[PDB]
Amino acid sequence: TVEEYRCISLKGVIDRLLKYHRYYECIQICKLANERFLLGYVFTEWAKDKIKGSPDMEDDELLDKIKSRLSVIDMTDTLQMVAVAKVAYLEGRFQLSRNL
Amino acid sequence: MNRFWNTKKFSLTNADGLCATLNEISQNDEVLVVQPSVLPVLNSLLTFQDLTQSTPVRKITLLDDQLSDDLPSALGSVPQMDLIFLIDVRTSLRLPPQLLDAAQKHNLSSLHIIYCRWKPSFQNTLEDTEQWQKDGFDLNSKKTHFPNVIESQLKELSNEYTLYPWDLLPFPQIDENVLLTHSLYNMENVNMYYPNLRSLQSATESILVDDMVNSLQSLIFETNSIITNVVSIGNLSKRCSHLLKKRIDEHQTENDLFIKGTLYGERTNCGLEMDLIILERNTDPITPLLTQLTYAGILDDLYEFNSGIKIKEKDMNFNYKEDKIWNDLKFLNFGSIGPQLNKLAKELQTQLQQRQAFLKNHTTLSSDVLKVVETEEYGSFNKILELELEILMGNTLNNDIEDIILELQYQYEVDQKKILRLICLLSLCKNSLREKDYEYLRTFMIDSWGIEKCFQLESLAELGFFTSKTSKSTRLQKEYRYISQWFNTVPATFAYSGVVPLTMRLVQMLYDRSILFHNYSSQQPFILSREPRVSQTEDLIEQLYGDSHAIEESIWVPGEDIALVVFLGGVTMGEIAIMKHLQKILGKKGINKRFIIIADGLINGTRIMNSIS
Structure with a gap:
């Protein structure tokens, strides 16, 4: 309802749906709500989950996908990928971490 | 401040x-x-x-x-x-x-x-x-x-x-119109453009250009300006312009690109223009060495101004924000000071005591300067002027130059710096010196002024000042007697031996090709253009620098006036005197503009000589 929506910010709503592995629905609320501040917060979570997901991938294709999905987003706030590079470095993938 | 550069407001x-x-x-x-x-x-x-x-x-x-x-x-x-x-x-x-x-x-x-x-x-x-x-x-x-x-x-x-x-952030000290940034000296009093160690030139140049770009970015973002036209001259200016463009296009925030769309934009414009003509001192080494004739020029080369605009021997300040006598006499010729001072003193007699003290101090200082000009190696101050005027037009003969160089070497006592500057000008004016005169001039120099002079004459012999007839850094490789034909430097002019500086005509040609019309002209793209343009003027500058790439013209926006003429390598203060004359004559002719001269530090002949030593 409208009153409950006042208690918690839009980020509280976006987190609840990012939790359950639905990365396309969220990115559509931000467009209609006319917001840009909370745009990259979805992308960073999606990239972290994708990197920490399928381990039997290939570096070149993974980087190609992770950089082609960045083309859609055109905004500079909370788009820090240092954490993404770190979590990539936290496991065996080192060349991909350096290339990111 | 707020699109209107209130320079004094920067001080607060x-x-x-x-x-x-x-x-x-x-x-x-x-x-x-x-x-x-x-x-x-x-x-x-x-x-x-x-x-x-x-x-x-x-x-x-x-x-x-x-x-x-x-x-x-x-x-x-x-x-x-x-x-x-x-x-x-x-x-x-x-x-x-x-x-x-x-x-x-x-x-x-x-x-x-x-x-x-x-x-x-x-x-x-x-x-x-x-x-x-x-x-x-x-x-x-x-x-x-x-x-x-x-x-x-x-x-x-x-x-x-x-x-x-x-x-x-930069603020003006010497005059209201001109600001000044101190980035040409270190804490060790070593020149930031002509260091006395020929092993680390590139890094020093990169650091200087980086600091200059940082200062320009700071000022531009403080005043909220949008550069539209850039006229880069030389090699280093190209890198400076590219770096400035990249840094502006990277670090700019939002809520202004939206304004960049509203203002200017596609299919429309709002008639706002700012120019960023940039020059390098190495392009024209012809006129940092001439003798000053304006009041502050004469007072400058005999008593060196420090970082602050003041002098050690005197006590009264030369700041313009509290005194008006200094405002109307600083850039006037020395000859037209006496009678003006006499009239100013006699008009007050009929007619507050602070004005009396100011005029008394100015009269005493002028009398002391006039006294010290004469009786101190009498005739030298004029003889150097006549010799320079004779050399600039060109009257050198066969082996007669060796007679006059030592004519005043010991007949009238003179400092090393005057001789070295004069011989550098001699070697630079003709754009080349034969291989049969260095063997004598260098021998006499090493004979008269020690053994370390060979190192000076070797280190100075690669920056272009001292060259022999037998990454270019944009040297000058054209005879000066030619340049006296395309341009009208020697006929309106002061602060020199009746000669117009080469930078003066270089900036003149960008807006009005009148002197270029009289000589070497049959057709021109225009006669009076508001915007800066360079076209059909390549060959003249192709031979003048050996490469048709020193001139760069950049348009940034896609589609009365503030012009930022920075000076990478110091300002010879005589150029400041002729800049006001340019502004006045251009305003008279019809084009109304305003010039702000950004300087990295005052440069002068003698102040250069200690640098390369």
């Missing part, structure tokens, strides 16, 4: 920031310790009385090895609250060892230092209010940076690192 911000920082240091009795190089700049901004009344500090000192012996005398005494050092680390990237040795020896229990930096406009007024706690700590600045910059070398003694970033 620095003083306010410094006062706020000093008063927020501590509410006790303070003692100030100031670096020797930066102190003259501070004194030119804040007076001693205002400094004492505004903040409770009561003592100022100097960074010297004398303080080491005075550590038990001066540092041990006073110290009512603490010691606040002030340092400049914008260049040379090295803290002075004086504070390093004083910290461990005297064992200070509270270390607070002040370091200078340009205004960070990218901080955009603290970016609102951190976005209501960064929307739940969505953004943070902890460890999101390199551990330290430059000052990482300070990792000794205690943890008293209460650094304070005092801001600084």
Whole structure:
């Protein structure tokens, strides 16, 4: 309802749906709500989950996908990928971490 | 300020920031310790009385090895609250060892230092209010940076690192129209463009251009301007323009590109133009060496101005914001000062005592200068003028030059610098010197002025000043007698031996090709163009520099006037005199513009000679 929506910010709503592995629905609320501040917060979570997901991938294709999905987003706030590079470095993938 | 460059308004911000920082240091009795190089700049901004009344500090000192012996005398005494050092680390990237040795020896229990930096406009007024706690700590600045910059070398003694970033932006001192940035000297008094060590030129040049770009970016973002046309001259200016464009296009915030769409934009414009003509001193080494004839020029080459605009021998200040007699006589010719002073003195007789004191001091100083011009190697001050005038038009003969160079070497006593400057001008005017005269001139030089002169004549023989007939850095490889035909430097002109500077005509040609119409012209794209353009003027500058790529014309926007003519490599103050004449004549002809001359530091002949030594 409208009153409950006042208690918690839009980020509280976006987190609840990012939790359950639905990365396309969220990115559509931000467009209609006319917001840009909370745009990259979805992308960073999606990239972290994708990197920490399928381990039997290939570096070149993974980087190609992770950089082609960045083309859609055109905004500079909370788009820090240092954490993404770190979590990539936290496991065996080192060349991909350096290339990111 | 706010699209209208109120230059004097820049002065208040620095003083306010410094006062706020000093008063927020501590509410006790303070003692100030100031670096020797930066102190003259501070004194030119804040007076001693205002400094004492505004903040409770009561003592100022100097960074010297004398303080080491005075550590038990001066540092041990006073110290009512603490010691606040002030340092400049914008260049040379090295803290002075004086504070390093004083910290461990005297064992200070509270270390607070002040370091200078340009205004960070990218901080955009603290970016609102951190976005209501960064929307739940969505953004943070902890460890999101390199551990330290430059000052990482300070990792000794205690943890008293209460650094304070005092801001600084350019402000005018010598005159209202012209600002000035001090980036041409280090703390060791070494020239930032002509260092006396021919092994590290490239890095020094890169550092100088980086600092100049940073200062220009600071000013541009402070004034909220949108550059539309760029006319780059030379090699280094190309890199400077490209770096400035990249840095502007990268670090700019939002809420202004939206304005960049509204203003200017596609299919429309709002008639706002700013120009950024850039030159390099190496392009025209013809006229930093001529003799000054204007009042401040004559007063400058005989008594060197320090970082502040003042002199050691006298006591009265030459600041323009409190006196009006100096305003109307600084740039006038020396000859037209006497009768003007006589009229000014006689008109007041019929007719407050501060004016009387000012006129008396000016009269005494003028009389002293006139007395010292003569009776001090009488005739030399004029003989050099006649010789320079004769050489510029060209009257050298076969082997007769060797007769006149030693004619005044010991008949009238003269300094080394005058002879070296004159011989450099001789070797540069003809664009080439044969291989049969160096064997005698160098021999006589090494004969008369020691053994180390060979090193000077070798090091100076590669920058282009001293070349022989038998990454180019844009030297000049054309005879000057030719340039006297395309251009009308030798006929309107003052501050020299009746010669128009080469930069003068270079900037003249960009807006009105009148003198170029009289000689070497059958057709031109225009006669009076408001916007700067360069076309059908390549071959003349192709031979003048050996490459048809020194000229660069850049349009940034897709589609009365403020022109920023920066000067990378110093300003010969005689050019400032002719700049006002250019502005007046252009305004008379129909094109109305305003010129702001950005300078990296006053440059002069003798001041160059000690540099390459």
